[PDB]
Ligand binder design. Structure first.
Ligand SMILES: CN(C)/N=C1/CN(CC(=O)Nc2cccc(-c3cnn(C)c3)c2)C(=O)[C@H](Cc2c(Cl)cccc2Cl)CN1
Length: 224
């Protein structure tokens, strides 16, 4: 997160770290005691999932192994459409003041809606500086029409843009897969942006989660 702030204690109990061994690979967001949502590009054979702490590589946090990933079959490595994935935990996480599932969206929030995105990505770019503390950036939803002015044909139908005009506040390396929450629901998952990060008027791009409610439910479904 470029030009963010340290997220308030307990305000993001759905944030997880997806670790490659001990090292940060991606963000992710708890959606059930057994299930984490994140970006398809974040996929690995196995993860260590850190839950219930604002501090990356927290020795006290619960780490739960995960080895089963369910990428949206429509994910493109070329265009990065459908950049969404569910990851099943080996064991269920215990809920607490630090651990809690996010509310999945019923509807798509409109442009201009106030949001917050979080992660342990670098706070500087191109030179990198990885924080201990979970960082937060307040951004607003940008219409497709407006975003297309910047990214043209790179933008697909289920990518969602967000940022603040003439601000650097934004996502960056290592924030991939993390939550964009607006109005108490998850509206986006960090997918991409321009490099170097934090260029004013280069929105962040997120997978638009309200467009995947059916796939998300079908994949987690636990009943007839
Ligand atoms: C789908 N998309 C095209 N691929 C990526 C690449 N990506 C993965 C990544 O960089 N992971 C990662 C995870 C942890 C550490 C580092 C890293 C970077 N530099 N070093 C030394 C380590 C990198 C990312 O994390 C990118 C982060 C990003 C964002 Cl989210 C917005 C604007 C610019 C950037 Cl560069 C997003 N997109």
């Amino acid at each position: 997160i470029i030009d963010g702030y340290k997220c308030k204690e307990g305000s993001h109990p759905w944030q997880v770290a997806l670790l490659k061994g001990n090292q940060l690979h991606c963000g992710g967001v708890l959606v059930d005691k057994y299930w984490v949502l994140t970006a398809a590009h974040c996929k690995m054979g196995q993860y260590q999932v850190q839950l219930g702490s604002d501090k990356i590589g927290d020795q006290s946090a619960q780490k739960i192994k995960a080895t089963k990933s369910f990428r949206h079959p429509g994910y493109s490595t070329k265009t990065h459409v459908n950049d969404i994935m569910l990851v099943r935990l080996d064991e269920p996480v215990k809920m607490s003041s630090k651990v809690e599932a996010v509310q999945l969206p019923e509807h798509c929030e409109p442009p201009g809606t106030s949001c917050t995105v979080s992660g342990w990505g670098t706070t500087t770019s191109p030179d990198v500086t990885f924080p201990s503390d979970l960082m937060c950036s307040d951004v607003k939803l940008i219409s497709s029409r407006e975003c297309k002015k910047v990214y043209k044909d790179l933008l697909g139908k289920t990518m969602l843009c967000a940022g603040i005009p003439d601000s650097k506040t934004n996502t960056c390396n290592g924030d991939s897969g993390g939550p964009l929450v607006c109005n108490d629901t998850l509206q986006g998952l960090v997918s991409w942006g321009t490099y170097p990060c934090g260029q004013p008027n280069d929105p962040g791009v997120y997978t638009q989660v309200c467009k995947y409610k059916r796939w998300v439910m079908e994949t987690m479904k636990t009943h007839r």
